[PDB]
Amino acid sequence: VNSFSGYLKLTDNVYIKNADIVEEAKKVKPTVVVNAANVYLKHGGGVAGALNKATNNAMQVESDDYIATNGPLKVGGSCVLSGHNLAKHCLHVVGPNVNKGEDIQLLKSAYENFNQHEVLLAPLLSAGIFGADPIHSLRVCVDTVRTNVYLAVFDKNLYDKLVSSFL
């Protein structure tokens, strides 16, 4: 038993809800919240901008030191950093950005990072401003992640479409 509430169960291990991931993190304080990161951990907009704003820019400060020490992530890769006031940990995962021409097959590799964590609160990777088809992202999530994932979909219209079209 865990504290996630109001989710629709899609599969044995995947759950979905129309929610703001920032507000969901602040209420659940999950062990892991996933950020829709880029390789530079520049948290400007989308999910990343919103999570970082909710940390009063502490996520960005921590991220800049991480990059200064380690260099950029790989597309499809991840790193674990602090969850600040939102979660114990933040798993920063880089899905391919279609608006940069990145290979969409890297979406499966990106979701594989979720399997290193028993339970996660997450957005759909490569959705929103990363330009991928969210229906496809949900399919890859279901077919790749084996651990327990709670997906927050900000937009109510998209949430309903994701549920209604789910196979």
> What are the distances in angstroms from CA 139 to CA 1, 31, 95?
25, 24, 14
**Residue choice 10, 16, 21, 106 for contact with ligand WXS (CB under 6 A):** 21
Check: CB of residue 101 under 8 Å from CB of residue 69. Answer: no
SS3 80: strand
| 50 counts as binding ligand WXS under rule CB under 6 A | yes
User: Which tokens go with 1?
Assistant: 């038993």
Q: Is 153 in the site for ligand WXS (CB under 6 A)?
A: yes
DSSP string, 99-124: GGT--TTHHHHHHHGGGGSSEEEEPP
CA distance 135 to 105: 15
Is residue 62 a contact point for ligand WXS (CB under 6 A)? Answer: no
Partner residues linked to 103 by β-bridges: none
Choices 44-52, 75-83, 101-109, 159-167; region in contact with ligand WXS by CB under 6 A: 44-52
Size of the site for ligand WXS (CB under 6 A): 14
Q: Which is nearer to ligand WXS, 47 or 107 (CB)?
A: 47
CB of 153 to ligand WXS, least distance (A): 6
Q: Would you give the DSSP letter of residue 34?
A: E
Decide: is 96 part of the binding site for ligand WXS (CB under 6 A). Answer: no
> Taking the complex as a whole, how short is the minimal distance between the CB of residue 155 and ligand WXS, in angstroms?
7
What would the x/- binding string for ligand WXS be over residues 119 to 138, using CB under 6 A? ----x---xxx---------
- Cβ-closest position to ligand WXS: 46
Residues 6+ apart with CB under 8 A from 2: 119, 148
Q: Contact positions toward ligand WXS, by CB under 6 A?
A: 20-21, 36, 46-48, 50, 123, 127-129, 152-154
